[PDB]
Amino acid sequence: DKICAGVASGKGTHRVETITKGEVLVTNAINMTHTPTSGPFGDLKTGNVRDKLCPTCTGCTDMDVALMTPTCNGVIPEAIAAIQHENRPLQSKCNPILHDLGNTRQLPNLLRKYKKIRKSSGIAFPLASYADQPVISNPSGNCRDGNGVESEFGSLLWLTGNTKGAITGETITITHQCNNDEVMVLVWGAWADLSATMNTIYGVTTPQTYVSNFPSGRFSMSPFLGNFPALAETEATTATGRIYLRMEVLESGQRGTIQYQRGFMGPGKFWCLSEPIPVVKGAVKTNGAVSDCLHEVYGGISKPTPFYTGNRGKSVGNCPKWVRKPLLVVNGTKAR
Amino acid sequence: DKICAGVASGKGTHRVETITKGEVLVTNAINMTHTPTSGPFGDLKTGNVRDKLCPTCTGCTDMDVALMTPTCNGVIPEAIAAIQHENRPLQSKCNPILHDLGNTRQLPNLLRKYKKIRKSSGIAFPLASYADQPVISNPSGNCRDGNGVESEFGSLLWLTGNTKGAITGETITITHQCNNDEVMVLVWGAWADLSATMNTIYGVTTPQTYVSNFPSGRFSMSPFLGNFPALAETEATTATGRIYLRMEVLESGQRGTIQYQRGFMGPGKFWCLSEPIPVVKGAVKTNGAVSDCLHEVYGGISKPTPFYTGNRGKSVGNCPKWVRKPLLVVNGTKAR
Amino acid sequence: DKICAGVASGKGTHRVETITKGEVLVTNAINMTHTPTSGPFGDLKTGNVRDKLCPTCTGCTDMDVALMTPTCNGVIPEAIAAIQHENRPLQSKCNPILHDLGNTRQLPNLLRKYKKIRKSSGIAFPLASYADQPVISNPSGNCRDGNGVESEFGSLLWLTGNTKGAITGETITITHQCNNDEVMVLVWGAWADLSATMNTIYGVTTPQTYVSNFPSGRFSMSPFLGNFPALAETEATTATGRIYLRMEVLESGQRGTIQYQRGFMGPGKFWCLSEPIPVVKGAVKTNGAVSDCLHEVYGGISKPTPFYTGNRGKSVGNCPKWVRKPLLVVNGTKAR
Amino acid sequence: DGMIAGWHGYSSTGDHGTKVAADLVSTQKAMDAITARINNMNKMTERAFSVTDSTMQEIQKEIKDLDKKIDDVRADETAAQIEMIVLLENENIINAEDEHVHALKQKLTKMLGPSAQDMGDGCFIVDHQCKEDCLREIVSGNYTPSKYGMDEFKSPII
Amino acid sequence: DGMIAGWHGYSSTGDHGTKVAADLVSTQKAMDAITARINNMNKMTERAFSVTDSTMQEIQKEIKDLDKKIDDVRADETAAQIEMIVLLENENIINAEDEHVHALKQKLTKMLGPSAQDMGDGCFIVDHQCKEDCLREIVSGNYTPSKYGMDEFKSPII
Amino acid sequence: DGMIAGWHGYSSTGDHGTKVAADLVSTQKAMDAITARINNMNKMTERAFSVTDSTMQEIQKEIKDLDKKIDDVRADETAAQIEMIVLLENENIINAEDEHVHALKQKLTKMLGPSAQDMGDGCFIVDHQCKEDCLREIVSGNYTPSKYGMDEFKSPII
Numbered sequence A, B, C: 001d002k003i004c005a006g007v008a009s010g011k012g013t014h015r016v017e018t019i020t021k022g023e024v025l026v027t028n029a030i031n032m033t034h035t036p037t038s039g040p041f042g043d044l045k046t047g048n049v050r051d052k053l054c055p056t057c058t059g060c061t062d063m064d065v066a067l068m069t070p071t072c073n074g075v076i077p078e079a080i081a082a083i084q085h086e087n088r089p090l091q092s093k094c095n096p097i098l099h100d101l102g103n104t105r106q107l108p109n110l111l112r113k114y115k116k117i118r119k120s121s122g123i124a125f126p127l128a129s130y131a132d133q134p135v136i137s138n139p140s141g142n143c144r145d146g147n148g149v150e151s152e153f154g155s156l157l158w159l160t161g162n163t164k165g166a167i168t169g170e171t172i173t174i175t176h177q178c179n180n181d182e183v184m185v186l187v188w189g190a191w192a193d194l195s196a197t198m199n200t201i202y203g204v205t206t207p208q209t210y211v212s213n214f215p216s217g218r219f220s221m222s223p224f225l226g227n228f229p230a231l232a233e234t235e236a237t238t239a240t241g242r243i244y245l246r247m248e249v250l251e252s253g254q255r256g257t258i259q260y261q262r263g264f265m266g267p268g269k270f271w272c273l274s275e276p277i278p279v280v281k282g283a284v285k286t287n288g289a290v291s292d293c294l295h296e297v298y299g300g301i302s303k304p305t306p307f308y309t310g311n312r313g314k315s316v317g318n319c320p321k322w323v324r325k326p327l328l329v330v331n332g333t334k335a336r
Numbered sequence D, E, F: 001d002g003m004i005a006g007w008h009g010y011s012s013t014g015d016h017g018t019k020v021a022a023d024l025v026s027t028q029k030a031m032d033a034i035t036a037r038i039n040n041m042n043k044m045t046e047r048a049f050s051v052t053d054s055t056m057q058e059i060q061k062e063i064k065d066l067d068k069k070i071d072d073v074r075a076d077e078t079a080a081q082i083e084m085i086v087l088l089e090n091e092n093i094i095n096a097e098d099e100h101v102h103a104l105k106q107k108l109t110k111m112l113g114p115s116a117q118d119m120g121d122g123c124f125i126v127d128h129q130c131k132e133d134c135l136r137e138i139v140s141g142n143y144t145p146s147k148y149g150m151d152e153f154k155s156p157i158i
């Protein structure tokens, strides 16, 4: 008889592209690509996605948490990823701050990009070290804390001393005060008010000059006195003045200098930020949603195959990689 | 008899490097690399290379088109690539602008990097919304339009109001006003003149303060009054004053703030720029030249092989890739 | 008899990971990874590692060499790599400079990143071209040169003219003055002093405005007069005033503008920097140490294998590449 | 040849028509090799090892553009590498079919004895009827030529 | 062996000296495989898929330097990958020579019948004269041992 | 089979027990191929060709972070590529073992003459005693069947 060894035929079902054989007809193939289906945003199975900076402190926004508002001083959970749900985070508590006239509008979008966000006890530059010796931090009156008691921003000190009148200017140096693997985030600024009010509080009627020099470069402002933008993003119904803020970032071994005239509001406390985490833009989380991957175009998605054919975007977690075309893998014999 | 199967010998002509066989002598090989030969700059077969921003509007430079000069308001063709033929594009029409005292010298080199350059009808910030209510845009007298009639920059409004004298300062907010996939490009500035002339026009004799805050950061200027650089880049023979400009760029969802005292010249119109395109440095196009690829070192080049061995640089189109050494591919049997 | 061809067995000693065979037990294998052992910093066998900018000029720091101090004008050797041993290089000679109130603190860390550091003879902007015609460069008195003779910074000219009193401001344009492949590094600044002293020297009592516009962007300062930081980083025991400096960098074809009022200290000389070299952070070199590679975590290291399994960091020279896991390569038959 | 159950197998064509049996060990081996190849393609989606500080949005456009460029270059190079690896793995999987048939040929070469005629196509001629039982013994590796009256290999003792 | 026309072929060496004929189908197969391999190297010059906003020149030096660094890293990694694919493809092309000769050997193994002596080098000894006509029949696949008085394989019918 | 000295070799098992000899030429070939494969892995650490201006430290954090990101992406992609080349080279080295044994089989196929029985496993039966001297002649390529009273291949002359 005739005894043969070989492989069996069958009908072709898939065509596979090869290096030298062209499109080979095969009896079966595995589809390595899928088209993602949009889902809700949620967690990633492997850990917490930050979403809101302080989810257990109601009545506050992320801008209010980042500014250490008297009533927004809660607990910030650790997260493995975060979602940027606000492109212009807004303030709702305390004295009005002109966040669109500086670089502090994105502060909540800086804190969220790290796994551990820690409030560091202690003033970045102590009150006892200021040139006009008996410096005090004044309560605002538009920052009530819990019981209706006038308070102040945890991160920002409205400073006054023993004298009034124009000065040459004072210089302070702020050094890094976090651990070796932490980045320090400072907030400082200036009080702007009507010239009558600036004279009453500080003894000056003209704009004052503020300068800073940090690794990010030199910053200088001379806030105009009066004709302020309409009051917004505050618990105050009447403010008269406005706060101008500057956000500063220092890493280990770094220093910065702040030259300031009258009206200066100093750092009161600072954030220490540890391990960086991935951040995507998107909607807030759906309560109870869990997925393998957060994509910017698709919300939570699954990874049924290692690759996908759809819209490209950033992604965090156990995500498929983008390819341009469907990819098939031989899982059978070559077709007859 | 003896019947053999095999391959035939021949004389070796090439040696090919292999992973484990060393340099194997073969009877033929394909040279996968070539040395490019410099050619003229031209189009890329697949579409228009922008070169000049407005090739059908004679007598104007790219800076005059970008500033929407009264006589330079032509049609901008779409392009798939562009050539940066000017490192410091110059102005030749209208009132003198101190382009080297700001970031507006490269404006023509920003517009050209996008496929579609569109003039957006409408003032970026309407005249009716300025604080000194009856604001008008004055003709320059050094911007004649066609018939000798005094005119103004399409992108820049020389604004005056109902009063004269020093002011505290005014604040305006400019929002994105293009489509979701377009980037908006603004031009704004300040008029500087002799203190006698600044007093005559605006009621002020000292430098005025201008501030802006856009995603690009904070900008501040206090133009000096008098002792101007020698008159250049203008159709004016006598100007007395000078214009200080700032270029601002906004993407979808972004805002910027402009704080301004007297002498402010406001946005009058803006550019909307759509799909980005590759840009290379090089000479203007040769009339009638067509190539497969525009290289920075070599002008238009062909792609006779997929790889080249020559000077590295940027390239646009159906270009060969740079390799370090000649690469040969076996196209024959092993030599005897 | 039975004559067989094959391979011989032996005991397995290593297991190698494969694409489809799993972990195959083999009789021998080559370990492609090693754990680096920290060594001293030193040279790289192939050439000089710069370390100190001017190793043959004792008594000077790298900041004094970079500032062209009268007694620090030595020879800078060429190097193939450099080590950043100072994160805040300090000055020890000449008039005090407020290096932490500008961008000049890192000047020595810019010069070292190029293979050839050349002092360019000639003033970047000649004295004869200044608006107040008979401009002279004054000796400091706190910059003694060799014999105790009063001198000046080679790179910085303390300029005075024929008049005193407030001025509108002057404008100068500085063009690139190095070769086509060299980058030019300029130093310019302003003298700040007590208002009585600023009046005595320049005829002014208030802060003066300084502006520059280079490819890096716009810079503006208005130095405060008096209340200076404690005297440091100087050979002076009493200085009264302070120097504010700005570092400017130009490449071929580039220009910059410096607008300046009274108190301006002008460019006196400049650096031309040629071929870039790799730079790592680390300790100064050990005298006589030579290694194949300088790593940021490990000092000089050897390359016994092409790959290493340890802490990742930058490296310069004939370095192994970082991998995540031990890698074995088959160097024997498959185990029985 | 095969798919009684399984891609790989043996057949006997003669006076009794064509009978088929399959070798489920070589078939499983081929499926395991294919699975392992897919399992080595699933690692190209896990090439992010380091986590650096991210660049935030709503900053200077040139910085945003460099961050986007880095992500776009990485994504395009990854997609191109994935496409080339898929093409290479499909070529290797197809070539394995011939490697597996060669192994089956050598199994028959030894089991059928010195008198079987090797036709070069992986088919052998034996002077006996081979009806199902013979294919089961071939698949199981228990075929012995002497059971059917066929010559065996000469022993090494002489 | 070959190049009467074509890289691959057959020869007959005996009482009549050496005669040669070539197989242009296997040769064409080899040429097509080489062309396809080159055609898979031509795709690494088209790996730019996304177009991002470009960074303009005449800007801050550090930004210009990062854009330049991205382009230089991409270009160096691409050149290294191209050099390695050329070395790997040359190795695979050379190995194909032995795969093609093996296929020709098996073609002769079947066509020449059970009485041909397989010398292990792809050469067979047959007890007949093979002068040109026999090589044409071998190349065309029409060789029949009985035409020359040689034994064919035993039929499967018994 | 082998390691009298050397990975690759021949053996003779019969009335005299098992004798072994080794082929140091095929063994050296395998060792050289392994060395060359390693020598093509040592080039993946030398892919930096261009030197650009470096980005200095103590600058704007976003710029420093982009420079760090570029270095971290390059390092992660390089490590992943190194791991895949090691896995692929180990697979190719193991497969070469079978390619080398096949070559040894064909050498025996030719040297032992037409009367040797090919058992399919790379073992041949010869009707003579093969005790050490025969293995030396096989390794050296000087084995001649007529020395032992075995048939040689038929000449091409007829």
Ligand SMILES: *[C@@H]1O[C@H](CO)[C@@H](O[C@@H]2O[C@H](CO)[C@@H](O)[C@H](O)[C@H]2NC(C)=O)[C@H](O)[C@H]1NC(C)=O
Binding pocket: A014, A031, A032, A033, A034, A035, A309, A310, A324, A325, A326, A327
């Ligand atoms: C393999 O998967 C891909 C991706 O899911 C399939 O391609 C998509 O098919 C749907 C129809 O079901 C189309 O609407 C999509 O536009 C396709 N995507 C692309 C990128 O073409 C593909 O058809 C699948 N192939 C097989 C054989 O299952």
Ligand SMILES: *[C@@H]1O[C@H](CO)[C@@H](O[C@@H]2O[C@H](CO)[C@@H](O)[C@H](O)[C@H]2NC(C)=O)[C@H](O)[C@H]1NC(C)=O
Binding pocket: B014, B031, B032, B033, B034, B035, B309, B310, B324, B325, B326, B327
């Ligand atoms: C393959 O092509 C390369 C590139 O064109 C050749 O190398 C160049 O040869 C010219 C001489 O004709 C030299 O002037 C160039 O300097 C060479 N370039 C390099 C990078 O070495 C190479 O000689 C060609 N080889 C063959 C066999 O055709």
Ligand SMILES: *[C@@H]1O[C@H](CO)[C@@H](O[C@@H]2O[C@H](CO)[C@@H](O)[C@H](O)[C@H]2NC(C)=O)[C@H](O)[C@H]1NC(C)=O
Binding pocket: C014, C031, C032, C033, C034, C035, C309, C310, C324, C325, C326, C327
């Ligand atoms: C191959 O080399 C690696 C790297 O040196 C070895 O792995 C290290 O082994 C030491 C113990 O000698 C451990 O302390 C290290 O932590 C190991 N490193 C890692 C990344 O695991 C590995 O053991 C060597 N293997 C062989 C077979 O020699």
Ligand SMILES: *[C@@H]1O[C@H](CO)[C@@H](O[C@@H]2O[C@H](CO)[C@@H](O)[C@H](O)[C@H]2NC(C)=O)[C@H](O)[C@H]1NC(C)=O
Binding pocket: A028, A030, A331, A332, D031, D034, D035, D038
């Ligand atoms: C290739 O196809 C085979 C089917 O012929 C797959 O094997 C089957 O897998 C399912 C699980 O999804 C089992 O329930 C069946 O019993 C399997 N069949 C056999 C005959 O084993 C195989 O998994 C496919 N390959 C891959 C990589 O998925």
Ligand SMILES: *[C@@H]1O[C@H](CO)[C@@H](O[C@@H]2O[C@H](CO)[C@@H](O)[C@H](O)[C@H]2NC(C)=O)[C@H](O)[C@H]1NC(C)=O
Binding pocket: B028, B030, B331, E031, E034, E035, E038
């Ligand atoms: C390898 O060399 C062969 C020649 O032996 C090339 O084939 C020739 O190609 C030209 C076109 O350039 C045709 O006109 C000839 O008729 C072809 N010859 C044969 C015998 O077909 C082949 O193209 C080369 N390979 C590559 C990839 O270029």
Ligand SMILES: *[C@@H]1O[C@H](CO)[C@@H](O[C@@H]2O[C@H](CO)[C@@H](O)[C@H](O)[C@H]2NC(C)=O)[C@H](O)[C@H]1NC(C)=O
Binding pocket: C028, C030, C331, C332, F031, F034, F035, F038
């Ligand atoms: C694989 O192992 C062999 C040993 O079996 C290595 O060969 C030896 O190399 C040393 C040098 O280190 C020589 O002194 C010996 O004489 C060599 N032995 C033989 C039999 O040649 C071989 O070098 C190893 N492979 C690699 C790539 O190093």
